[PDB]
């Protein structure tokens, strides 16, 4: 039994960049399976390696992903991301096709706290532990909604996407690095994952699910 | 004036299965429109049948639904469901297209309530009453959250999809069915929709909308 | 370093129709980019037009976003709608692919307020203030809850899209249009985005983003 998905996010055009594939298993620990190169060349995360098989048809125009000898355990929801760059770098993400089956070392990063509480206007502040040193170029960090595909929020350690909100930050070097929000907001209500791909195989921290309280009230009429 | 729209969740490999059309009505009211088998059968839902064609394209590897004669009776948003099986069971959904047009006898499940209201921890319980028998092995619970298209969250009445906290349990059979939580979590505030498909045309529940208050608060400070 | 994204959301049939794309900068200021009818001819919006191109493929059944020259700036969500009539029309929306790059006169139309805070059951009104006098039956309405694609909910200023509860209406002519809804209901709580039509290039309002309170409590035990 093998899993087959498609991808394109890309058009025609394109020169180049490298299609990768990323699962994310329910409690939301992101797991990056690996990549085709426009050039046809490969590469896929030891975990599987036997199993998997990512492939392409610019005859379709539509990239694939075969999981061969499924099991209950890769129950996921499936993204596809596009990645190029020169100077300038494109990351876009597809949507996530949500799969469910039936029968029943790297650079490890470490999100904290798993869920943080924060009432509105409040200084906040979100730790990821690398397990080893990390090119603080090649850290990231995505923003995650409810429903949504991961937003590059923040990249190269402390580089701001463009749009993110002033209130962010991003501190950092070798094995610890950090989120910061100058003043909670509610639209930050989401989920933060630190990204890292300097070391093969390309990992994602856990997660930190962000969420503030209401802020105050009181009963003084009175 | 007809509707079309397309569908491509599986990728090149693939040796059989099922791709379904649903969708689902502004009110959430899910409805089974029907499916394309890989040897290429098909199977209309008579609520129409008439109007519905479904179709495929190995050479674009796209699966098309035709719905001809539309009205502002159709308009909902649509989803292409892939469904394979040995006895591994392969299930996943497309993402929803939403379609706004312009214009002005099976087993009924009945989803109940229609909004339960809990607090975290709680212990919760929703039931879902058939309108005749079904098969236990064929009734199937489906969750979704406000923007997501539904995931399989219990199949076979009572067995959980891999990576459902197991707070959550499935219980009945023959004509009364019900699904429960050990005690809230917030995480759980979506909807559930009970599904069954032993008998044709395969049917939907109504909806159940979960949400979760806040808890208690208190003042004396004081 | 140029700007590739596919869309695919009619299926084989089909005999006209316009397929344009829209992107949503975070802010979630909308903005309409151009489009492509059937019979070739296609529409781009002046503020581009020397870097944006248009394409489509009956081959592969795609269609092509290539925007060159790409910059920081170009960091969006982007949308692929179609639209078709005769009487009735049919509109439907991708999902939003994001996208995110790094290095580093018409009808203006004018949300208002920002963000306007309700209770339950309360009676609502958000207005739209247009640059100047725009067709009552080329002014829209779109809801947008976090992480979906715009809904149509209103159309030709005063009618609602099939499933619309019944709460809701829209006032208007010439230059000041509005939506109001009879009593919130927390379903209701998204983003209201008030669209022009009649006069090119289209236009999208910046945003109301609707959400209500909770509602008063007491503590008289007491
Ligand atoms: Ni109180």
């Known amino acids: 039994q093998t899993l087959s998905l498609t991808c394109?996010?890309?058009?025609?055009?394109?020169?180049?960049?490298?299609?990768?594939?990323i699962r994310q298993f329910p409690g939301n620990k992101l797991d990056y399976?690996?990549?085709?190169?426009?050039?046809?060349?490969?590469?896929?995360?030891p975990s599987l390696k036997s199993r998997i098989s990512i492939t392409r048809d610019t005859s379709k125009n539509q990239v694939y992903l075969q999981l061969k000898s499924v099991s209950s355990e890769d129950t996921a929801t499936?993204?596809?991301?596009?990645?190029?760059?020169?100077?300038?770098?494109?990351?876009?993400?597809?949507?996530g096709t949500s799969v469910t089956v039936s029968g029943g070392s790297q650079i490890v990063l470490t999100q904290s706290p798993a869920i943080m509480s924060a009432s509105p206007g409040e200084k906040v502040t979100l730790t990821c532990?690398?397990?080893?040193?990390?090119?603080?170029?090649?850290?990231?960090?995505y923003q995650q909604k409810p429903g949504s595909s991961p937003k590059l929020?923040?990249?190269?350690?402390?580089?701001?996407?463009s749009g993110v909100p002033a209130r962010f930050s991003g501190s950092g070097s070798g094995t610890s690095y950090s989120l910061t929000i100058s003043s909670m907001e509610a639209e930050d209500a989401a989920s933060?994952?630190?990204?890292?791909?300097?070391?093969?195989?390309?990992?994602?921290?856990?997660g930190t699910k962000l969420e503030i309280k209401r802020a105050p009230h009181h009963h003084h009429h009175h | 004036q007809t509707l079309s729209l397309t569908c491509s969740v599986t990728?090149?490999?693939?040796?059989?299965?099922?791709w379904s059309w649903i969708r689902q009505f502004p009110g959430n009211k899910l409805d089974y429109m029907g499916y394309?088998?890989?040897?290429?059968?098909?199977y209309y839902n008579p609520s129409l049948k008439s109007r519905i064609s479904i179709t495929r394209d190995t050479s674009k590897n796209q699966v098309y639904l035709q719905l001809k004669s539309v009205s502002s009776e159709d308009t909902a948003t649509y989803y292409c469901?892939?469904?394979?099986?040995?006895?591994?069971?392969?299930?996943?959904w497309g993402q929803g297209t939403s379609v706004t047009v312009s214009g002005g006898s099976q087993i009924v499940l009945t989803q109940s309530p229609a909004i339960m209201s809990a607090s975290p921890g709680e212990k919760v319980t929703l039931t879902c009453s058939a309108s005749?028998?079904?098969?236990?092995?064929?009734l199937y619970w489906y969750q979704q959250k406000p923007g997501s298209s539904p995931k399989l969250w219990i199949y076979?009445?009572?067995n959980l999809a891999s990576g459902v906290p197991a707070r959550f349990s499935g219980s009945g059979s023959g004509t009364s069915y019900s699904l429960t939580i050990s005690s809230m979590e917030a995480e759980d505030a979506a909807s559930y929709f009970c599904?069954?498909?032993?008998?044709?045309?395969?049917?939907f529940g109504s909806g159940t909308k979960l949400e979760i208050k806040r808890a208690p608060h208190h003042h004396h400070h004081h | 370093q140029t700007l590739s994204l596919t869309c695919?959301?009619?299926?084989?049939?089909?005999?006209?129709?316009?397929?344009?794309?829209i992107r949503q900068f975070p802010g979630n200021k909308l903005d309409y980019?151009?489009?492509?009818?059937?019979?070739?001819?296609?529409?781009?919006?002046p503020s581009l037009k020397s870097r944006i191109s248009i394409t489509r493929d009956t081959s592969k059944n795609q269609v092509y976003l290539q925007l060159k020259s790409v910059s920081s700036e170009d960091t969006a969500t982007?949308?692929?709608?179609?639209?078709?009539?005769?009487?009735?029309?049919?509109?439907?929306?991708?999902?939003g692919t994001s996208v995110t790059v790094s290095g580093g006169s018409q009808i203006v139309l004018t949300q208002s307020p920002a963000i306007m805070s309700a209770s339950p059951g309360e009676k609502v009104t958000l207005t739209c203030?247009?640059?100047?006098?725009?067709?009552?039956?080329?002014?829209?309405?779109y809801q947008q809850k976090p992480g979906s694609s715009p809904k149509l909910?209103?159309?030709?200023?005063?009618?609602?899209?099939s499933g619309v509860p019944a709460r809701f209406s829209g006032s208007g002519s010439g230059t000041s249009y509005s939506l109001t809804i009879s009593s919130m209901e927390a379903e209701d709580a998204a983003s209201?985005?008030?669209?022009?039509?009649?006069?090119?290039?289209?236009?999208?309002?910046?945003g109301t983003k609707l959400e209500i309170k909770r509602a008063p409590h007491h503590h008289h035990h007491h």
């Open positions: 005749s028998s079904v098969s236990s092995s064929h």
């Open positions: 394309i088998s890989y040897r290429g059968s098909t």
């Open positions: 076979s009445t009572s």
């Open positions: 599904h069954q498909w032993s008998s044709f045309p395969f049917t």
């Open positions: 990728g090149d490999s693939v040796t059989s299965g099922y």
């Open positions: 469901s892939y469904f394979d099986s040995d006895d591994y069971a392969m299930e996943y």
